[PDB]
Design a protein around this ligand. Structure first.
Ligand code: HEM
Ligand code: HEM
Lengths: 54, 442, 49, 406, 100, 195, 54
């Protein structure tokens, strides 16, 4: 395939979840928390790991 | 209704000092149909004999010694009578349909055939190539090859496994003799039945038959009827693949009880529950037959049919669907699920209809003269006498839910089935899978 | 033509001794399934332990 | 007792002939015959008849598409519709008192059809296939084109909705088509295994359109057509016809007897493996005669000219007063035989109770076939040979002739 | 004493789904019934509703409503689907019944 | 060398109608005639023009009608195709037809012939400006004959004849057997047996 | 859908990786190690976790 971003087994996973993903247009700001919750997690796991090391 | 049944005339029966059983149903109809039904099929053939009975069928009409082709044909056509017939694995027959003003003439014609076929060494050689061709036509009918293959594997290694028409080799080489050898061995009064239905009165029939069927038995063999070697069923599969065909055919089945057995009624009632579909129906709302409904909702198949084909001491209780290369699986999944449902959690609301639908068939099973005759012919030959609608009624008028289950499960649950499938069948899962599709995770 | 086709012989070849024509396969197999399932029944059993 | 109870016919004030016959069968069948059909369509609205033939099961006012299908099924009933270019019969079988239960749906299906714009919009794609399977028989395709070349106006209309019109029939054209043809003056409530009074007590509810005549198919004008369908199937289906016949017209029985006087003749007259028969359709205000010939490709020519020559010389006096007796007696049979199976028989009681309004007994129906002979058969053929002909054909054809080559 | 009619009108204007310009029926949650229902809806209406619904999402997307004039007035709200939606539901209850 | 060889084209009085309701009928009627290289040819070319304004200027409602003309090796065709509104197709065909008819019955002034004769001269000379269409000319002849008729004589030939032919060409049409073809609704359209 | 094992977002993942998954028939016994390797991992993580707790 052409795009080579929609054919690759892994990118296709990303380009279908953070790009090309159909989202309503009128999404409110309340929908910003799933995002935050996720990055909130990345953050904990990081700081935590780094903290567990001591 | 019950009265309508109760007022249905009895079917007269009587054997000759010969051995032939002469039965009939007098009606009124200016027309009628009479014929003989033989206790002979392909089942009775050998590895080298197989096909005879069929080669034989294709000559039965082409003339007798008493009256050559040109004549026999001319004499029947001329009286507006119709002569037709067939042969299965355990049952052959020849029947004529005229104006009951000719019982005697018909009766004579009949006899003259089942007793003196010309077997013109010159005619034979012709039909030989006619079959070999006709056979290559029966072939592309993937709806029939499939059943043959079913029997093949279902009763592999036994007399039943052989197809009614037979191998091309046999047909290419059967001898003027073999045919005669097949005739004089199986066409005997004890195994034959002369049946009729129409304006015909029994006596005139008997006499007429008793007159043209002048057979005489000396020894005890002649007078006795030989029982066949049992046929071993085998849970197995056979896959004739070819993605070259438009769609696939599938047929799965368990061993059947056999004419004699009663349950063939309850079992006959169950099949009425799953019934059959066919893209020309009008019904995403079909009463039960979810298999049909589902088949419609999810487009599972082109059609399918439930069947309880049975024989003397065995049979086949299964189903067959025609489907697109891609919906083979779901179809099989969904169907095979219905058998389980059928014998594991059936309901009265279901069996109730089941029955009715049967009774309506049971009756239309006798719509006309030719068909009635077929029952008398058969019934006697396979059951022993005749079963009046009045009877079939009760038999299948007292089947409740618990009865269906008990039986179906008795014949279906955790049994090793026999499947067959020609066409683009890559999607049909392995045996093991369809196998474990024989037990419900109750 | 398909009429020209037979199923090879598994007789002896593979079939267990209770399987050779002219004898109902059915009288002998509730015994055949009984064995197999018993073996499996036992494994589930041993495994639980 | 003796199983005799004169089939009673009672023409209601509407014109709705009601006929019955209690033959005492364990199962009975009621049926609504009508003088509808594609014979009444225009350059537009076409196929509306066909689609109508498929809508059988769509919702009505007295019962829903669901209730009707499962309704009939719960009883072991059978709802179905047999249609011709100029007549539609809506039958339905069952048994005992389960007939009473059956009727409601039949009643509704024919008079209270409220074709919903969705239900049809969702049904029409059917045509595509119902038609597709039927056409798996070369025989049907050629006959469709036969009539095409046989006429110019009505009756020359297709029996299966033409392609171009599939998803275009409207929920309206269906009402309008019904409203104008499903009218008491052109209907009949036939039935078997039923008590005539009881069959009458129903006809009363079955009253929604006094309409009378309603529409009216334009008199079928004749034409000397010829359409060839090139497709190389390996074997040609060729049919040749000549204006003639007419149901109820005396000239009729003639052909029926020539239909048999002929056959062995054309058949017993040819070279190589084939098939040939005498064709014969007797319509309301017209009809057809001739013969269809399934023949091997290259041999088609030989096989057609032949079957033809026989029909020809047949007129030139090649009929012994013998051949006529044989024939005359074959119809007697085919008639009497094609009436054993109640449904085919019911088709007889109805067809007449709709056309005439009477019932010619087997006695006279024969008296009529017997009534004439020879001084006609020889002649019927003449009409053929002389009159203008119109052919139709399917298959390779390359070796097949055109009517201008006879 | 207090008209449901007086009330209904209160609630209608209270809800506010009209400041976006859409009919009552333009808001019913699309469960199985409403889905069948809408599919039976004539094409005239379908596209009408389609646009309305999109025009509403866009307002909402902009955090802005429609000018007072354009607000659909209670008494002019057209129950375009309720008739359909109704048959769907009783058609179904009929089946939900028979199958028992 | 010669290789194969197309069998001489036998003629037939055919008529096939294509029912499809497109809202407007395409009807064409022809009669055996013409032949590339055959003298009788130029005649129609001149009738092809002698006709047209006639059929066109002779009708009712929005439509289109022209004189058809194909000149083949061992045969040819003449007549006319008529794109017309549905229901009006009948009127539009009979008409175009009547004109072709009466045209033969002497409705051609030695004027109309001059006009025509001079239109071909143009269409010929014009349909040769674009090299590819021109190349089509140099070739078609170098294949059929093996020569090259100069514009001088090609005209000398179109001029070579007239009137005592045009009137006549039409006759051949009217009298001879005809074969029609058509697409569209058709319901209001006639069959050759209705002329 | 019918199967309800091939329609569900999660089961469909399993029924497509441990069932209905097309595997060659002639697979050798050497192919048994991916399996083992995986269960080998489940085992470590288990025993380990349980061991880390002390
Ligand atoms: C899901 C995200 C996490 C949450 C909700 C979370 C929450 C907390 C909480 C409530 C504390 C107490 C802070 C205090 O003493 O006031 C804490 C401490 C700790 N967490 Fe997490 N934690 C998370 C993940 C992690 C992970 C994955 C690690 C590292 C592998 C980690 C390692 C620790 C350690 C070592 C402490 C002790 C040090 C300290 O409390 O300052 N945390 N965590
Ligand atoms: C990928 C799988 C793992 C491997 C290859 C692995 C391997 C090992 C090794 C080589 C040892 C040394 C044993 C000895 O003392 O002789 C060990 C010890 C240990 N591992 Fe793992 N380990 C794995 C996962 C885990 C995990 C995920 C945990 C728990 C969260 C864990 C916790 C420990 C602990 C606490 C020890 C110290 C106790 C002991 O050594 O007996 N291990 N592991």
């Amino acid at each position: 395939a052409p795009n080579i971003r929609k054919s690759h087994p892994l990118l296709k996973m990303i380009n279908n979840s953070l790009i090309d993903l159909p989202a309503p247009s009128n999404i409110s700001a309340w929908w910003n928390f799933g995002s935050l919750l996720a990055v909130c997690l990345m953050t904990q796991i990081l700081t935590g790991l780094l903290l567990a090391m001591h | 209704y019950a009265q309508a049944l109760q007022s249905v005339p009895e079917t007269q029966v009587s054997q000759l000092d010969n051995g032939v059983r002469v039965a009939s149903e007098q009606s009124s109809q200016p027309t009628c149909t009479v014929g003989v039904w033989i206790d002979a099929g392909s089942r009775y053939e050998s590895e080298k004999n197989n096909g005879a009975g069929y080669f034989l069928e294709h000559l039965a009409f082409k003339g007798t010694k008493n009256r050559p082709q040109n004549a026999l044909e001319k004499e029947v056509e001329s009286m507006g009578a119709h002569l037709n017939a067939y042969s299965s694995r355990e049952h052959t027959a020849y029947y004529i349909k005229a104006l009951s003003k000719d019982v005697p003439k018909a009766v004579e014609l009949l006899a003259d055939i089942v007793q003196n076929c010309s077997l013109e060494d010159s005619q034979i050689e012709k039909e030989r190539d006619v079959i070999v061709r006709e056979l290559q036509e029966n072939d592309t009918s993937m709806r029939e090859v499939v059943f043959n293959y079913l029997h093949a594997t279902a009763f592999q290694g036994t007399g039943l496994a052989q197809s009614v028409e037979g191998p091309s080799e046999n047909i290419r080489k059967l001898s003027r003799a073999d045919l005669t050898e097949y005739l004089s061995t199986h066409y005997t009064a004890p195994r034959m039945v002369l049946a009729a239905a129409g304006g015909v009165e029994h006596q005139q029939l008997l006499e007429l038959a008793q007159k043209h069927f002048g057979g005489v038995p000396f020894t005890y063999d002649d007078d006795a009827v030989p029982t066949l070697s049992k046929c071993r069923f085998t849970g197995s599969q056979i896959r004739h693949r070819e993605d070259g065909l438009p769609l696939a055919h599938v047929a799965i089945a368990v061993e059947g009880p056999g004419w004699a057995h009663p349950d063939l009624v309850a079992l006959q009632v169950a099949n009425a529950i799953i019934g059959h579909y066919d893209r020309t129906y009008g019904g995403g709302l079909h009463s039960s037959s979810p298999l049909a409904s589902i088949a419609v909702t999810n487009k599972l198949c082109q059609s399918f049919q439930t069947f309880s084909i049975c024989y003397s001491e065995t049979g086949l209780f299964g189903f067959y669907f025609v489907c697109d290369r891609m919906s083979i699986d779901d179809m099989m999944f969904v169907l095979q699920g219905q058998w389980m449902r059928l014998c594991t959690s059936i309901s009265e609301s279901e069996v109730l209809r089941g029955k009715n639908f049967l009774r309506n068939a049971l009756v239309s099973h006798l719509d006309g003269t030719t068909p009635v005759c077929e029952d008398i012919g058969r019934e006697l030959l396979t059951y022993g006498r005749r079963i009046p609608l009045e009877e079939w009624e009760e038999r299948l008028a007292e089947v409740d839910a618990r009865m269906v289950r008990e039986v179906c499960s008795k014949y279906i649950y955790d049994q090793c089935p026999a499947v067959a499938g020609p066409g683009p069948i890559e999607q049909l899962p392995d045996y093991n899978r369809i196998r474990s599709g024989m037990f419900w995770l109750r | 033509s398909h009429t020209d086709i037979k199923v090879p012989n598994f007789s002896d070849y593979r079939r267990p001794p209770d399987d050779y024509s002219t004898k109902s396969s059915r009288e002998s197999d509730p015994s055949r399934k009984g064995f197999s399932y018993l073996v499996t029944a036992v494994t589930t059993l041993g495994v639980a332990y | 007792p003796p199983h005799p109870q004169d089939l009673e016919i009672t023409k209601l004030p509407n014109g709705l002939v009601i006929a019955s016959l209690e033959n005492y069968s364990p199962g009975s069948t009621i049926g609504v015959f009508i003088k509808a059909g594609s014979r009444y369509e225009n350059s537009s609205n076409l196929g509306t008849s066909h689609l109508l033939r498929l809508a059988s099961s769509l919702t009505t006012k007295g019962a829903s598409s669901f209730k009707i299908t499962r309704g009939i099924e719960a009883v072991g009933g059978k709802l179905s519709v047999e249609s011709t270019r100029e007549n539609m019969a809506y039958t339905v079988e069952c048994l005992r008192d389960d007939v009473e239960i059956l009727m409601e749906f039949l009643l509704n299906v024919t008079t209270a059809p409220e074709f919903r714009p969705w239900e049809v919009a969702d049904l029409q794609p059917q045509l595509k296939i119902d038609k597709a399977v039927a056409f798996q028989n070369p025989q049907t395709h050629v006959i469709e084109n036969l009539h095409a070349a046989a006429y110019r106006n009505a009756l020359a209309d297709s029996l299966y909705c033409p392609d171009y019109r599939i998803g275009k029939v409207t929920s309206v054209e269906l009402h309008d088509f019904v409203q104008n043809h499903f009218t008491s003056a052109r209907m009949a409530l036939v039935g078997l295994g039923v008590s005539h009074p009881v069959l009458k007590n129903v006809a009363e509810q079955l009253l929604n359109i006094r309409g009378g005549l309603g529409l009216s198919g334009a008199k079928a004008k004749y034409r000397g057509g010829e359409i060839r369908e090139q497709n190389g199937d390996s074997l040609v289906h060729a049919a040749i016809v000549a204006e003639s016949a007419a149901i109820g017209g005396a000239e009729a029985n003639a052909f029926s007897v020539l239909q048999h006087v002929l056959g062995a003749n054309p058949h017993v007259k040819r070279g190589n493996p084939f098939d040939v028969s005498a064709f014969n359709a007797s319509y309301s205000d017209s009809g057809l005669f001739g013969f269809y010939t399934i023949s091997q490709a290259a041999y088609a020519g030989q096989v057609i000219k032949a079957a033809y020559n026989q029909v020809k010389t047949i007129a030139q006096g090649n009929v012994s007063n013998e051949n006529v007796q044989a024939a005359k007696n074959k119809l007697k049979a085919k008639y009497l035989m094609s009436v054993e199976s109640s449904e085919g028989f019911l088709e007889e009681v109805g067809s007449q109770a709709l056309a005439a309004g009477s019932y010619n007994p087997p006695s006279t129906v024969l008296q009529q076939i017997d009534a004439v002979a020879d001084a006609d058969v020889i002649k019927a053929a003449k009409k053929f040979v002389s009159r203008q002909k119109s052919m139709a054909a399917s298959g390779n054809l390359g070796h097949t002739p055109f009517v201008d080559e006879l | 004493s207090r008209w449901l009619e007086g009330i209904r009108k209160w609630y209608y204007n209270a809800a506010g789904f009209n400041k976006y310009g859409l009919m009552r029926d333009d808001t019913i949650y699309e469960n199985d019934d409403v889905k069948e229902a809408i599919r039976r809806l004539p094409e005239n209406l379908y596209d009408d509703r389609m646009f309305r619904i999109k025009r509403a999402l866009d307002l909402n997307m902009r955090q802005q409503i429609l000018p007072k004039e354009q607000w659909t007035k209670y008494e002019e709200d057209v129950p375009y689907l309720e008739p359909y939606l109704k048959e769907v539901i009783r058609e179904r209850k009929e089946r939900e019944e028979w199958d028992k």
